[PDB]
Scaffold this active site. Sequence first.
Site, PDB file in Angstrom:
ATOM      1  N   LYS A 127     -13.709 -11.406  -4.886  1.00 14.34           N
ATOM      2  CA  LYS A 127     -12.829 -12.143  -5.839  1.00 14.34           C
ATOM      3  C   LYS A 127     -13.342 -13.588  -5.954  1.00 14.34           C
ATOM      4  O   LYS A 127     -13.011 -14.458  -6.821  1.00 14.34           O
ATOM      5  CB  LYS A 127     -11.386 -12.054  -5.687  1.00 14.34           C
ATOM      6  CG  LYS A 127     -10.748 -10.650  -5.770  1.00 14.34           C
ATOM      7  CD  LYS A 127      -9.436 -10.453  -5.670  1.00 14.34           C
ATOM      8  CE  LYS A 127      -8.991  -9.040  -5.421  1.00 14.34           C
ATOM      9  NZ  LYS A 127      -7.286  -8.959  -5.588  1.00 14.34           N
ATOM     10  N   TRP A 167      -3.906   7.306   0.112  1.00 10.59           N
ATOM     11  CA  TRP A 167      -4.424   6.454  -1.043  1.00 10.59           C
ATOM     12  C   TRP A 167      -5.721   7.026  -1.720  1.00 10.59           C
ATOM     13  O   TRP A 167      -5.953   6.799  -2.970  1.00 10.59           O
ATOM     14  CB  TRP A 167      -4.423   5.077  -0.754  1.00 10.59           C
ATOM     15  CG  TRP A 167      -5.306   4.852   0.287  1.00 10.59           C
ATOM     16  CD1 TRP A 167      -7.000   4.557   0.427  1.00 10.59           C
ATOM     17  CD2 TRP A 167      -4.861   4.216   1.792  1.00 10.59           C
ATOM     18  NE1 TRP A 167      -7.252   4.148   1.700  1.00 10.59           N
ATOM     19  CE2 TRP A 167      -6.166   3.816   2.612  1.00 10.59           C
ATOM     20  CE3 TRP A 167      -3.672   4.206   2.280  1.00 10.59           C
ATOM     21  CZ2 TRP A 167      -5.842   3.201   3.629  1.00 10.59           C
ATOM     22  CZ3 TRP A 167      -3.555   3.472   3.661  1.00 10.59           C
ATOM     23  CH2 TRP A 167      -4.725   3.158   4.118  1.00 10.59           C
ATOM     24  N   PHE A 210      -3.557  -6.917   7.305  1.00  9.87           N
ATOM     25  CA  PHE A 210      -3.882  -6.477   6.422  1.00  9.87           C
ATOM     26  C   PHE A 210      -4.085  -5.022   6.073  1.00  9.87           C
ATOM     27  O   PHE A 210      -3.711  -4.437   5.099  1.00  9.87           O
ATOM     28  CB  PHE A 210      -5.251  -7.208   5.643  1.00  9.87           C
ATOM     29  CG  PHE A 210      -5.051  -6.833   4.269  1.00  9.87           C
ATOM     30  CD1 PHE A 210      -4.402  -7.355   3.278  1.00  9.87           C
ATOM     31  CD2 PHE A 210      -6.271  -6.210   3.963  1.00  9.87           C
ATOM     32  CE1 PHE A 210      -4.575  -7.304   1.937  1.00  9.87           C
ATOM     33  CE2 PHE A 210      -6.636  -6.020   2.247  1.00  9.87           C
ATOM     34  CZ  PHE A 210      -5.561  -6.466   1.345  1.00  9.87           C
ATOM     35  N   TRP A 211      -5.093  -4.276   6.903  1.00  5.43           N
ATOM     36  CA  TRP A 211      -5.521  -3.163   6.754  1.00  5.43           C
ATOM     37  C   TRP A 211      -4.483  -2.256   7.468  1.00  5.43           C
ATOM     38  O   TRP A 211      -4.259  -1.702   8.583  1.00  5.43           O
ATOM     39  CB  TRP A 211      -6.665  -2.934   7.577  1.00  5.43           C
ATOM     40  CG  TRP A 211      -7.972  -3.821   6.783  1.00  5.43           C
ATOM     41  CD1 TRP A 211      -8.629  -4.947   7.583  1.00  5.43           C
ATOM     42  CD2 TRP A 211      -8.338  -3.804   5.582  1.00  5.43           C
ATOM     43  NE1 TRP A 211      -9.415  -5.411   6.802  1.00  5.43           N
ATOM     44  CE2 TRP A 211      -9.339  -4.745   5.528  1.00  5.43           C
ATOM     45  CE3 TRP A 211      -8.085  -2.932   4.433  1.00  5.43           C
ATOM     46  CZ2 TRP A 211     -10.141  -4.999   4.563  1.00  5.43           C
ATOM     47  CZ3 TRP A 211      -8.690  -3.139   3.180  1.00  5.43           C
ATOM     48  CH2 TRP A 211      -9.785  -4.239   3.193  1.00  5.43           C
ATOM     49  N   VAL A 212      -3.796  -1.160   6.704  1.00  7.05           N
ATOM     50  CA  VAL A 212      -2.807  -0.363   7.142  1.00  7.05           C
ATOM     51  C   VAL A 212      -3.283   0.727   7.789  1.00  7.05           C
ATOM     52  O   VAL A 212      -2.905   1.105   8.796  1.00  7.05           O
ATOM     53  CB  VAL A 212      -2.592   0.525   5.768  1.00  7.05           C
ATOM     54  CG1 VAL A 212      -1.434   1.940   6.074  1.00  7.05           C
ATOM     55  CG2 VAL A 212      -1.592  -0.269   4.895  1.00  7.05           C
ATOM     56  N   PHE A 215       2.138  -1.069  -3.152  1.00  9.36           N
ATOM     57  CA  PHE A 215       1.520   0.018  -2.422  1.00  9.36           C
ATOM     58  C   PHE A 215       2.019   0.385  -0.970  1.00  9.36           C
ATOM     59  O   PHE A 215       2.079   1.457  -0.672  1.00  9.36           O
ATOM     60  CB  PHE A 215       0.081  -0.831  -2.230  1.00  9.36           C
ATOM     61  CG  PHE A 215      -1.124  -0.127  -1.419  1.00  9.36           C
ATOM     62  CD1 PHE A 215      -0.846   0.109  -0.139  1.00  9.36           C
ATOM     63  CD2 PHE A 215      -2.081   0.435  -2.026  1.00  9.36           C
ATOM     64  CE1 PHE A 215      -1.694   0.656   0.740  1.00  9.36           C
ATOM     65  CE2 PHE A 215      -2.988   1.055  -1.300  1.00  9.36           C
ATOM     66  CZ  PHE A 215      -2.992   1.284   0.034  1.00  9.36           C
ATOM     67  N   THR A 265      -8.550  -6.995  -9.489  1.00 14.88           N
ATOM     68  CA  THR A 265      -8.283  -6.180  -8.136  1.00 14.88           C
ATOM     69  C   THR A 265      -9.270  -5.484  -7.731  1.00 14.88           C
ATOM     70  O   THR A 265     -10.181  -5.323  -8.520  1.00 14.88           O
ATOM     71  CB  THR A 265      -7.152  -4.970  -8.869  1.00 14.88           C
ATOM     72  OG1 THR A 265      -6.686  -4.066  -7.993  1.00 14.88           O
ATOM     73  CG2 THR A 265      -7.811  -4.486 -10.070  1.00 14.88           C
ATOM     74  N   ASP A 319      -3.301 -10.435  -8.331  1.00 11.87           N
ATOM     75  CA  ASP A 319      -3.635  -9.549  -7.542  1.00 11.87           C
ATOM     76  C   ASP A 319      -2.867  -8.264  -8.370  1.00 11.87           C
ATOM     77  O   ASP A 319      -1.789  -8.429  -8.678  1.00 11.87           O
ATOM     78  CB  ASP A 319      -3.480  -9.962  -6.228  1.00 11.87           C
ATOM     79  CG  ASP A 319      -3.643  -8.714  -5.191  1.00 11.87           C
ATOM     80  OD1 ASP A 319      -4.683  -7.895  -5.568  1.00 11.87           O
ATOM     81  OD2 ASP A 319      -3.252  -8.636  -4.231  1.00 11.87           O
ATOM     82  N   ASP A 331      -2.044 -11.111  -2.078  1.00 13.62           N
ATOM     83  CA  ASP A 331      -1.071 -10.997  -0.644  1.00 13.62           C
ATOM     84  C   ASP A 331      -2.347 -10.687   0.553  1.00 13.62           C
ATOM     85  O   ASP A 331      -1.674 -10.912   1.689  1.00 13.62           O
ATOM     86  CB  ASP A 331      -0.417  -9.623  -0.631  1.00 13.62           C
ATOM     87  CG  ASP A 331      -0.919  -8.306  -0.730  1.00 13.62           C
ATOM     88  OD1 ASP A 331      -1.962  -8.285  -1.470  1.00 13.62           O
ATOM     89  OD2 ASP A 331      -0.547  -7.418  -0.095  1.00 13.62           O
ATOM     90  N   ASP A 356      -2.470  -4.477  -6.037  1.00 12.87           N
ATOM     91  CA  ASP A 356      -1.681  -3.836  -4.854  1.00 12.87           C
ATOM     92  C   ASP A 356      -1.087  -5.009  -4.258  1.00 12.87           C
ATOM     93  O   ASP A 356      -1.651  -5.906  -3.800  1.00 12.87           O
ATOM     94  CB  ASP A 356      -2.736  -3.273  -3.967  1.00 12.87           C
ATOM     95  CG  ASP A 356      -3.225  -2.026  -4.694  1.00 12.87           C
ATOM     96  OD1 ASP A 356      -2.612  -1.301  -5.507  1.00 12.87           O
ATOM     97  OD2 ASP A 356      -4.680  -1.968  -4.729  1.00 12.87           O
TER      98      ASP A 356
HETATM   99 MG   LIG Z   1      -3.185  -6.853  -2.516  1.00  6.50          MG
END
Ligand SMILES: [Mg+2]
Lengths: 194, 194
Positions: free
Chosen positions: B132, B63, B42-44, B16, B97, B8, B143, B10
């Site tokens: 993926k 981003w 996971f999602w910022v 990141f 990615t 991966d 991650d 980021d």
């Molecule tokens: Mg990642």
Amino acid sequence: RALRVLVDMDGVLADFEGGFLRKFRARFPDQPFIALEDRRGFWVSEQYGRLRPGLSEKAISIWESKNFFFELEPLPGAVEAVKEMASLQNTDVFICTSPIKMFKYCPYEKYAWVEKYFGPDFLEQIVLTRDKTVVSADLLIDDRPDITGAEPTPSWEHVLFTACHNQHLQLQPPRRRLHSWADDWKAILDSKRP
Amino acid sequence: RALRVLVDMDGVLADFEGGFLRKFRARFPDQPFIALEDRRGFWVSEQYGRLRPGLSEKAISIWESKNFFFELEPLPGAVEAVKEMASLQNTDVFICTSPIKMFKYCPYEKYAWVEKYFGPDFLEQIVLTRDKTVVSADLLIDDRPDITGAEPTPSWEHVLFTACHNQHLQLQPPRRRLHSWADDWKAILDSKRP
Ligand SMILES: [Mg+2]
Ligand SMILES: [Mg+2]
């Protein structure tokens, strides 16, 4: 359970050969060129290189220029066929395409071109990779005759999409062709279903 | 025959989370933020969205800005580990990615970042895709805790790379972690060899 089909972009969805010739002739009007009927071999720059010294670099300069990929015209029937194919039950379609080595414009323009012809939601179906053998699927429709890479035994069956550079090629018996998007692509898909 | 490993970008090769926080604080000094130790999920943008209205859009704007991906710093040990991993016998490494939805800068900068840290020849090992599970390999080091897509039974084993947002997660027994690039990644690879 869903049949998975990978569809190539240049030479299958987008008219790279005609776009290239048009721009090459406009930019280099004093140089000899290769009519599409006389194209032979996958690599355009190799054939131009044989026709006259320095022509391979001039040919490369056309597809490395900004807007070359974005302004390619769709092949007849391609947008309609892929839209219909993606809407079929038990069928997942991904656009699997290899960018050129100079990456300033090509990846970006390929995403922009897919957004333009298929819409924002189709961007989720794009796979950019130099190696298509590591992408698993039931079928790969692609105009390149020999597709190789890290996986010696790809899971997909490669169906050769006809193009000016491969139309005279005799394939080893097992191998199949899709002659154009007017040809019967649904029969090909169905032959792979459970 | 060669072991194939997907790595991966980021959160595994590129930092990141730290890059995002630094730029978010510089651009929006009057807004509250989430220290990395307090990151959860996971999602910022989802966590920022819960901390105050309008913050999710402000986080996204970081981003989506030019140079955000290109200026990310490598995680400690990542460049060295992946260079060593790729040079191992019977071992093929691909960087797999997923780009963000706004594609003006992200794909281009990710290729530029790989060229900067791994060199031009490594560009051939990049696979950009939102899904993926359709990439086949023996291992995927990533991650993100839950990696799903069109293939219900991916061929790779997913090894979870530790990140601030997943470090407290208890995984279902079979699942393994790589804690950092200082951890023993060669032992993980070898456990998958013939
Ligand atoms: Mg990642
Ligand atoms: Mg092609």
